[PDB]
Every structure is written in structure tokens, then in C-alpha cells.
């Protein structure tokens, strides 16, 4: 026994140090202030009424007339504070917003032969083949002439109804309110939005001097082929200026120290079994995170490029995307670095009995999870075919899955289930609740419960 | 052993092909766009304020004055966009809406003898015997003279307080707003709604050229015998024009291939046990679906009849109804086609132990399901007699059943339970929660748990 | 065996007939229309804004100024429809509403000695000893002179802050709006509400000729000793005129047939064990219900007393109360009549195993229910002392009990728990959820589970 | 056996008396009236709209302009009822409110070297080192000159973004509305709030003569370094004048009697065992509560000091703080006094089998609670790093813990989880629900279930 404990103790001390270094690094990413940074930003643009005479938020656009009322009203009064603007007196506006639109060709769809005398034209769903590249209206520059994703230094974006290319027709919005109002009013009078539009984007970014963060804003308004409007938004905080405080220089030392542990674990793996799989997972995700972290040092040259002329649009689109992907993988590595503690938790005959239960159980939990999810996904596809054209909570097959988890827990919206289909709605709900929650979910309890008393009946004797 | 595994494997390959054909066919019915088609429609007619000076939605009518304010206001501005109208610039209005009312005779009920000097008349709940067929008001046309369900090409409808005949008094609404306003104002000035009205219906339909769907609208406003008003609505998508894209012509090949599989399974069943019951259920439901699918081709001639003169009401009532019944049965066939996968899932000693648990358990789960539902329905009938005259969530014996499932899951409205009856409300809630959720629901759990360890203790030894 | 089955079958046939007669009698009490009767009533008086320039409902009074705005505004426009009034064109107003107030004496409490130079008077909480009986203001009749509970034909009422006597100062409101406005404005100008008030009541009643029901309305507005206002309401349906239709005359035969069954069971019991306890409970509650039914036939003469002069308040207060008590007891008899079906449900070796589980288990479930409820009520008293001065959901020891059931199920209001006390709120919630829901609630399940496998291990061998 | 029972009976009889005396004491401090005292107070200041024109509550400030609109508007109309003021006609305003602010130095933070030509200054997060002590503006007394926490008789306060010193810049608000409006307007015109503000406090107190309580009010408005505003409030009832009624004089005897029990139990425990641990807990907390109660008798001289000249701010801040801490420890001692009943509950072979289950189980429940909370806290840190900058329900690591308990119970806000991160949101929610609720939580079930059948299999034989 002792010679195994003597190597395990050195691994445990090494691992507690590795855990502590990553926890210090990742607590160093944020302060409670940063939620209020984005909350105060989003309430100014989203939750201010579109006009002083109107009930609608930007969260509640329904037409091109609402979108013009927003972009002439609530947007401009959010951006331009009385040259410079600070969107609150603490937070500097970085120069110049941008508007971009994406558009579809007239006649890009098959009108049925019976209707062609009555309906002259149609415009498809947005796609790279239906996308429109011809110049239109008065043709006075980039608002009315197409430019590609590569010409515009842009990237493809995931909307609600479609993914969208980084390309389009675009305008840069001036330093001040009176200039920008004349620009947006010129687009409106020239009918810059019409039948062919399928999205618009409004982008800008802001710097907080007091806690040293950049917040990058995207507003995306989609214009479905069914008619109507769908608004959406992003407000992303970034720490582009890496180090300024003594605490940043301490994090910079931990950031170097983390690479020594990752190198040590890469060598130990160079020198089949769940802990070895989890070691590879932790190491690979850490190497990916370090690769993104290193790549971000050259992406930060976009800030150096911007600071030569603050009449340019600050293209922090890629920086925000890779900060999000870094934060995503940092959060996931922290999670797996906690799960590995279960290698060491086996202190005594209680902890080893609990951990032996989970590993001996997982064979049957996996078998029953497939068996459960066939029935759950059959219910998801039943729900999608019955309610998916009526109920927001079921509008996509993805939402059918998430809503069926909400219903099993107790977050239920039964009034809209029944109003969508008075015959199948109650039958679906009643049978889903009965077969999932009163019957099938209790199989997990049976599997776990019998495995635990099995394991305890062995460890009482081994 | 080998020959049985090989014949089962040929059935499994045949079944995976059948499954994939039906999954392709039913994914072919819809796109995420279609929810936004009905959402953008319903928000225009339902959620727009009834008048610019008022707070009420069509969802919140409460009087004949609200209904006239709606039909002179929010309705007309939803229908007529500035001859033709597109209900959004993408969706064509098919010619002509229709208004229909159903009505009850004066003196169709027994006034108590003690009150006949004070109350001169009464008007019953709507029924086929209380229904009024006499001409009234100025008698100028079909708005003031009765016509039968068969004269009107209609069908009987399920409302909230009653089912309703397709018959009645009716008017067709003209091509444009100024014509329709003069028609509706003429009905209002002649007092076309009075003591005897028990429902009105407003019907119309629309076509989306961009994704090739019709949408059929019913608004039903009921006028209960208690006084007051109850609004309700339907917005139904329809794919009447079967095939136009290469993907539709591919789906048409899958539609023929599905008939060959159903023929194969009909012959195999012609050439007592749950899989045989499920095999018959899948076959019969698929034969009914194919029958409705064929009958719908005869019904689609109603579109060809309409397109000769677009100054006429498009009677897609039956097409919408049979599309709903087709979607209803199709969704249910998909569900049972997924459940049949369990005929083949017995890959190994884990999967056979899980499937053997459910079949060996279901005997005792059915016994306890009766025993549970006696107590549950006793509580449902207690709740209906105590709260049914006070609380919306218990306003019918059907609502009581669904609300008691919501309460067991934790979707609860306890403040209105107590305000309805301060003595029995808390007693009902407390005892229901204690006896159902803390006690009786755990019997299912005990039955399953003991069955699983029984089955596992056998399959460890057999 | 056979000689036992032959008597049990005759008891079962007798019991199914008794069950059906009672179920017919209680289905005879209601139609789905009756929910809409009370809903349409309550929305007119409660949910209409207090004044056209105001945001408050009667559900949202907060001052005597709101109460005068309601009683001069929304009340009068709800009652008087343009002599007679129909509260909707279907429902007759029975003559005359009544206003009553209850009041407390000046100096009915002990002002501290340190404060008597600064505070000249105090007025206690309402009680029968603090209650005020002196005439005040101009003393022009019953509005300004006290009359007792017996003088006024009244009864004691259960409010929110206190129970109230049926006594007080009172006024009868006239047949028409212009008369009633002059009466209420005279009370307002004479300052009829002042610091001494502790409640007002506004009472009236209504008749629906179309489904033959009366509705009796109480509005109670309480005026707490803390300052402020608490509104509350009752709308109660009544079937005073019992028999008019062929279905009522059928129910009148069922009503007599039910008395024959109760006589038969009284004799059988005159000719220690749970079924015998349940048999006595059903018989006693049925005899109490028949007694209340017979007493209500004598009370119904109040309608005959009213119908001589409809310029008088219809005192249906007792009829509404005894109908509520009849509905309360009838619903409970129906519940126990369903539970007695378990005396016969033992058809087979599955049903007898399920019923033997509950009877053999209940010994230990009762022991653990006490043991659980000591901890639950300790948490209820902890919550009452910490949150009960801050959070509505804990504002009484009864609310604490009902809210803790809601939290165990999943209906949670955690934001207000934390805002009331940022230190103990999270500690209370976290420990309550952990010890009740993750730990103690699983003891009921463990007791049931082990009892079931015990009972099944015997019935496999006996 | 008998000689153990005869001494245990004397302990039980002594303990029931101790229990009853404490329960009488804690009921004696409170009534359901007190919830309506704080509710009627808070609705006047918080829920009244900020002006006659604006929609915002004090609960919904977002700028210095909202704060000035509140303090010139909704505050003053809540305080000064038409010399004296009663905040409802029952509740006297004690003299004089106070406004205090806390402030940070210009240049107290490191502006990055790249930006110093563009951004002239920054102001840090509030801390005792960044705090500003210099006199500013016109310097006309205590509003414009700093005073220490000790000079101001104050204490340090726990806000939302920070703890705050009791020090600062302050003004005492006059007896009447016209005076107080001129004071607040003078601060507004002199720009008393600016870039450097990090909190303001508005404090006052009130007396209810009718139920003999003081209520002490704090309003705290924070001004984060991100720009924007965060409002918060406290309304605390106090029984400072201890005894006046015969019921208070009865409680004064119980309050002395309680000390004889605490002395008896101090002696008995002075003359490893869990019941002795619980005895030490009950005794120490009771001695601490008695110490706080005795200290509060000396603190009540602050009322006697205030009553000499009411043109002064009543500093009931410490009295309110210690009354809250007394209520906290009183509620907790009541809770542990209920738990000690489990010493005596062992009446019979059912109760001793239930109590033997919980003590024999707790070894493994502690082991698994550590094992569960590693995974739960890993998910908490994952959620904090992903959603914490976007979602209010995750805006701190403490909020993440409480929200994850709400989600396990079925209080869910899934729409905002997905809108914050469309990739990781659904993955986090789905895996959290699956691994916590369908899997890991059910280990607690397995532990308890197997322990109960173990203990019962022993007590069937011992």
C-alpha cells in the first residue's frame, strides 16, 4: 500500500498547484462590475422605447417602419451624448458605427404556373446562391454597390433563420448625431430597405477607462421571406490591453506557469482508461486554449491599426469572436480540471464505495439513456410536427428538445400547447408527462439504486 | 442461432429503409420559416390594439362594442395594405373574407313563474334545437336571412362553450377597405348583433409565393348566454400546390416508395402479442394517412374552382381541416415507427435487461395506474365542484385534469386557489400535494425499482 | 371462497348504484357556462380601471381616495346599465346594493408616556371590545348611527386582518345611477371614512334568467391600523329556484333515491377498522348534507320575502353561505364515495398486492410524517420570523406553510427571499432545499419502496 | 429500562416548558399587521411612479436624472403629508431625513499609455484607498466637506457592488416640503452628483402609535464605475418601547424565566455526542441572544436622546442593525430548539427505526454531498465564466449557486440562458439537467433507500 500512496501524494500536490494556477488565471478574467457594464449598455439600446410616442422596444420591432423609427430614434440617442461621445459619461464610443445589409435576387424562386398572371415576382430565403450582387437605387457608393466578405475584412455570422455571409452593401456612420441622422435619412428616402432585404447589421464598439474593457456591439435585424422582422443583439466585453496593474503582472506570471504544467503533462503522456482519456482531454483543450491565447496577441494589432485614425470603423469582430471562443474553452477546461479531482477523492471506504458505484453503473446508464432518448426524440418529432408551426417553444427541433427538458423539470406553458391544437395538445402533454416523468425517468433511479446496493454488498466483504 | 440473427438482420435493414423514407417525407413537410409565417400573421390581427385610443387586443374583447371596434378597426387595417392586398408585402390576400353568425330563438327557455312579470324573455345556450332560422332586421340579403350548412358548403365547428353548425346568417366582404367599412358599418347601424347571437365567425385566406404556402384564418367570437364575449382564432398553413421544386419531385418518389412498404407489411401481416399489435397499428394508421392523402387530391380542385373568379370566398375550410387531420395522423405514425425500433434494440445483455424490465413491469404499472387515477379523478371532481365556478385553471373537468398534472410538476397558481375558497383551497392543495406527490407517485417508482432488480437477478443466472 | 364472493358482488352492485346516483346529483349542480358567469361579472367590477384617467383596479386600491374614486366611478358604471338595470343585458340587478362600515373608538390603545405630548390619539386593531357604537357626523339616519348584527339580519364575516361582526353603520343604495351618485357623494362630503374605520362592505345580488342562477356579490375593503387599504371580493352563484326543467325533476327523483341509500346504510351500520370508519364518515357527511339541504329549503323563503318589494336589499348572505357549505360538504362526500371503491378493487393478485402495500405501509408513513413536519414547521417558524415582516409569500404562518409546499414542488420566488434578508435568505433557501428536497423527502420513498418489496416477497409465497 | 425512562421523563417535562416559554416569547414580538406596515410603506416610496409623466419606479432608476426626478418628486410627496407629517395618517415621521454620498478621487486608476492623449481622467471602483476626502463645489458646509464614520456616528454598510464606509458628505433634510425642496434643488444646481460619486444614501424613520412600532428606512442608490445606477432599499420595523400592555408585562416574566432555563442548561452541560453538541449550540446562541438583548437596553438611550429635540436625524441605524441580528439569532435558536425534540421522539419501534436511519446514514450522505458539490460547483464556475457577463441570474458566483438550485427544482429561465450564448447555453443546460437531475441527485435516493432497508433488517431481529 505505502509505495502507491507515496507516488499518489506527489501527483496530488502537483495537481492542487495546477488547479490553483488555473483558478487564479480564470478568476482574473472578470469582476462583478462587468455584468453591470453589459446590463447598462443593453438597457440603453434595447429597452428604451423606439420613439417617445411608441410602446415598442428594439426587442419588439415588427416592420421596416419600426426599424426606421429605431435607427432614426432610440439608436441615435443611445450613441451620441453631448467632438466625442461617451455612451454613459464613463464609456468612450470608438469613432464610427457601420450599417451592412444582405439581399436576395428578384425571381430567385419558382412561382406556380396557375398564379403567374396574378403574382409577378418572388424572393427566396437567403442563401449564397440566392444572394444579390447588383448595384441599385442612385448607386452613390458603398451603400448601393456590393462588396465581398474579403473586401470588407468580415466573417460569416450565425443568425436565427439563416447563417449569413460577411459580405454586403454597407455605410460607415459619422462622428456625430446630426451627420448620422442625415446619412440614415438619405438611405430611408432612397428606399434602401425593400422586398429583397434578408438581414441588416449595425455594429460599433465602446471603451471603459475605469475597469479597462472594450465592449463590442452587434445589432442584427433579420427580414424573413414570410414578411415581418426579427431583431437580435450581441454586447461582448473584451480585455484587449493585456497588462497594466500589479494584479495583471501576477496573472502574467501564472500564465507562464500554466504552460510549464501543460508541458509536464504532454511529456508524461508521451511517457483505454477514463483518467487517461480525461488527461488527454484536459491537455488538448489547454493546448487549443494556449494556441488561441497566442494567436490573440497578433489579433490585438487591430487595436494598434485602429488608433491611427478614429474616423475608421473598429473591426473588433474577430477579436470578439476569438475572445468568446477563448472564454468558451477556458470555462470548459476549468470544468474538466475539477472533474479530475475524483482520481484523488478515494480517501476511505465511503468515498471509494461512491466512486466505484458511478463507474460500475455507467454501462447500464448509457444503455438506458439511448433507450430513453429514442422515446424522448419520438416525442420531440411528434411535438415538432404538431406544434412547430404554432408555438414559439417548439418552433425548431432544437427548441422541442429544450422545452421537453423544461416540461420534465416543471417549467410549463400548457395554455399555448392546448390553444395550438385542442385535440392532440392535451393528449401529447398528458402522455409525455405520464410516460416520461411518472414511468421512464424512474428507470434511472432503479439502475442507480440497484448498482449502489450491489457495490455496497461487495465492499462489505472484499 | 446464426440463421435467426441473419433473418432478423434482413428485417432490420428493411425497417431502417422504411424509417428513413418516412423521416424524409415528414421533414419534407416544413421549414423553420413556417412558424414565423403564422407568428407574423397572428401578431398583426390579434396583438395590434383594437383602436389607437384603446388598450384591448382581439385576445381581450369583452363586449359587442369591443367586437365592433375590432371589426371596424384592427381587422381592416390588418387585411388591406395599399386592386390587391398583400397582408405583408410577401403574402397575397385571396379575394374576399366572410362573416357568419349563429343565433338562438326568443323564449327558448323556461323563466320561473315568480319572475314572468319582471323578466319578459330569455335566450338559451346554443343548440341545434334552440337555433334560430327566421329572417330579421331589414331582410335585404344573406346577412339577415338564414342559410343551411349544406347551402353554404360549410361544416360543423368545435368552439369553447359549444359545438356550432356550419349554417347561419352571412356576408361576403368586398375586395377593398372602403367597401368593407361601408358593409360592416351597415351591419352595426342595423343592430346585426343582439341578445340572440351566440357566435360570429370571420374567415379568410392568404398565399405566400416565396415559400409556396397558403394560410387559412378563422376568427371565432362567442357570445355566452351569461352575457359577455369569448374570442378565439385559427391560422393554418397549407401546401395545396404539391410539387414545384426538385426536392418536391424527390419527395413524390418517397411518397410512392412508402406505399410499397405499406403493401409489403400488409402482405406480411396477412401471412395477441405487442409487436404484432404495434405492426397492425402502424399499418392501419399509415393506410388511413394514405387514404386522407389520396382524398386531399380530390379536395385540391377547390383551388382550381376558386381561381376562375377571385371576387369569391376561398372555402379552404375542409382542406385546412384534412391537412390538420393528416398532420395529426402523420405525426402519430412517425411516433409509432420510432417505438417499433425496440423490436431490434436487444443488442446485448444490458439492452435485453432494460427491455425485459418494461414488458415484465407493465402488468403491475397498469394495475397501479387505475388505482392512482381513481384518487386523481376523485381530486379532479372535488376540485371541479369547489373551484370550477371561480378559477379559470379548473373551469371544466378537462381543465382540472391538466392543471393537476401541472401542479404535480410544479407549475402552480396557488394565490388564485386560496382566493377562490380560503377554507377548502389550502386543504385541497396541501392534501393533494402530500398524498399525490409525497406518497402515491412513489408507488410507480417502487414497482419499477423492484421489477428491475428482479429482472437483473434472473438475467445474472439464466 | 364462493359464499364470500356472492355477498360481496351484491354489495358491489348496490354501491355502484349509490355512486352513480350521487355522481348524477353533483353533475346536476353546474354547466361550463357558470365559470363564464362569475368571470364576466368579476372582470366588470374588479379589472375595469377605477377612473378613465387612472391605472388602478379595485384589485389595486391603496388609499381612501382610491376607494372614493372606485365607489363614485368604476362601481356605479358596473351596476347601472341604461327603471331597471341588467349588469350585462342578460343578468338582472336585484333592486338595491348596501354599504356597511365597521369602526374603532378614539383612544382604544395605550400611547407610551414619552410620546403623549406629541401624539394626541390612537385607534386599535378591530375587535368586539375596541368596536365603536356612538353616532357621529350629521347623524341623519343609518349611515351615521350604529345598528347591531341582529338588528341588521347579518352574520359575522372572515376578513384578511380580522374577523368582523355583522353590525355597523349602513346605507341602502338606490334603484338608479343619478340617485346613487348623490347618496355616495353625500357620504364623501360629510367625511364618512376617517381614521376610525377598519372595514367597509359593499353588497348586492343578480339573476341570470338564461341558465336560472342568482349571483351574490360582496366587496370587502379593509382599512388596517398601519394606514393603507386592503381590497377583497366574493362573487357566488346560487340555484334558489330548484326545479323547472325535466332534468331538474329527474334530479329531484335522484335526490329522494339518495335519501333511501343513506337510510339503508344508517340501518346497516346500526346492525375499529378503516372501511367501517370510512362507511361512518360517508354516512355522517351525507346526513349533514341532507340536513343542510332541508334547512336551505326553509331559508329559500328569503327570496319570497324579497319579491314583494324590489326597493329593498336582498339578504342572500345566509343562502350564499349555506350554498358554499353545501358545495363544500357535497364535494367532500363525492371524494370519500370515490375512495370507498378500494373496498372492492381487490380483483386479482396484482390489485391485492398494491392495496396491501398502502395499508401495511401507513403505520411507518404516519411516524415519518410527524418527523418530517417537525422539521418543516421549524423551517416555517424560522421563515415567518425572518421574512414574515418583508415578504408577502411569508406574511402569515399559514402563508409560510403553503409557500414551503410551493418551493418543494418548484414554484419559487427566490429574488424576494434574498432582497428581504441578504444573509439569512440564501442560507434558509439553500438549507431548506438541501434538507427537505434532496434528503428528507426521500425517506417517504424509502419507506414505500421497502414496504412494496416486503409485501411482494410475502404474496409470492402465501 | 424503567430507571432510564424515569429520568428521561423529567428531562422531557423540563424541555417542553423551555420550548413553550421560548415559543411564547417569539410569537410575542410579532403580528400579521406588521407585514402590512412595511408593505404600505414600501409601495408609497418604491412603487409610486417617479413623476406624474414618467413610467419608472425608484426600483427602476437608471441615471442621475432619474435620481434627481425621484428626490425632487416621488420621495417628497411620500414624506410630507399635509407642523408635522404622518406618512399615512397613522404613522408619524420622526423629525428629519438625511442624505449622504460616497465619492472616489479623479485619477485613482491606471489609464493605458496608448489612450492618455484621448482620455484625460478615470475614477476607480469604490474602496477605502480610492475614497475621496477633499472639499468641492461652493464648500457651504457638510454637503460639500467630508466627515469621518466616527464624526457622523455611522457604521459600514454592505451594498451590492461594494461594502461602504459610514463616512462621507451629508445633508439633514428639513421639517417641511417647501424647505426640503429648496435644499435638494440647491444640491442639483451645484452639481452635487458627478463622475466621482459611487453611492448615495437617504435615511429616515417613522413611528406607528396604533401597534407601537418604529420603522427605519434606508434608500441606497449606487453609481457603478461602468456608468448607470443601481437602486436598493431597507424598511425595518422595531419594538423599541419594550413594555406598555398587560401582554408585554406577561412577556417580561417569560423573558426572565428563559434565563433560568439557560442557567440550568449552562450548569448541566458543564457538569463527541451529537446531542451535547446541539446543547452547546442552543446554549451559546441563547447566551449571545441574551447578550445582544441586554446591549440593546443600553442602545435604546438613543431614542431618549432623540426625544429632547426632534429637529435632528434619529440614528436608529444601530438599533435596527442589532434588532435584525437579534431576530436572526432568535429565529435560529427557535429552529435548533425544535430539532432537539428528536432526543425524545423515540417512543416506539417505528420512531426509533426512522431516527436510527438518519444517524447511521449521515456518514455516507456527507461523503456524497462533497462529491456532488464538486460537480455542482464546477458547473457553477462554468456558468459564471460563460453567462456571468450577460445574465442577471448568473451575475455573481453566489447568484450561480442559487440559480442552479432553482433550476434543479424547475424554476427555470431558459430563454436568457440561450440568448447569452447559443452554442454553450443549450449544452450547459442540457448536460446540467441530465447529469444533476436525471443522474447525480439520485445517488442521495440510493444512499437513503439502502440505509433504511439495512436498519429495518436489523431492527426486525435485535
Author numbering:
A (entry chain A3), B (entry chain A4), C (entry chain A1), D (entry chain A2): 34 to 115, 126 to 314, 325 to 515
Reproduce text from the manuscript describing this model.
pmcRenal polycystins (PKD1 and PKD2) are ion channel subunits with associated genetic variants that cause autosomal dominant polycystic kidney disease (ADPKD) (1–3). PKD2 forms homotetrameric voltage-dependent and calcium modulated ion channels in primary cilia membranes. Each channel subunit encodes six transmembrane spanning helices (S1 to S6) which fold into structural domains: voltage sensor (VSD, S1-S4), tetragonal opening for polycystins (TOP), pore (PD, S5 and S6), and cilioplasmic (N and C termini). The putative external gate is found within the ion selectivity filter (L641-N643) that is scaffold by two reentrant pore helices (PH1 and PH2), and the internal gate is located at tetrameric S6 junction formed hydrophobic residues (L677).
Between 333 K-665 K particles of the variant channels were extracted, processed, and refined with C4 symmetry to resolve their molecular structures at 2.76 Å (F629S) and 2.70 Å (R638C) GSFSC resolution. Like previously resolved WT channel structures, the PKD2 variant subunits formed a domain-swapped tetrameric channel architecture. In the R638C structure, the guanidinium functional group is replaced by a sulfhydryl, disrupting a hydrogen-bond tripartite network formed with carboxylate and hydroxyl sidechains of the PH1 (E631 and T635), and selectivity filter (D643) residues normally found in WT channels. The ADPKD R638C variant removes a cation-π interaction between R638 and F646 and reduces the coupling between the pore helices of adjacent subunits. The VSDs of the F629S and R638C variants structures are captured in the deactivated state with S4 gating charges (K572 and K575) oriented for hydrogen bonding and cation-π interactions that facilitate gating charge transfer. Despite the localized disruptive interactions, the pitch and secondary fold of the PH1 helix are preserved in the F629S and R638C variant structures and only cause a small dilation (ΔRmin < 0.24 Å) in the external gate. However, examination of the variant channel’s internal gates reveals key differences in L677 and N681 sidechains rotamers that effectively double the length of its restriction (6 to 8 Å) along the S6. Voltage dependence of opening (V1/2) of the F629S and R638C channels were positively shifted (ΔV1/2 = 27 to 32 mV) compared to WT, which dramatically increased the free energy of gating (ΔG°) by 133% (+1.2 kcal/mol), and 152% (+1.8 kcal/mol), respectively. In contrast, the F629S and R638C variants cause partial loss of function having normal trafficking and assembly, but impaired voltage-dependent gating.
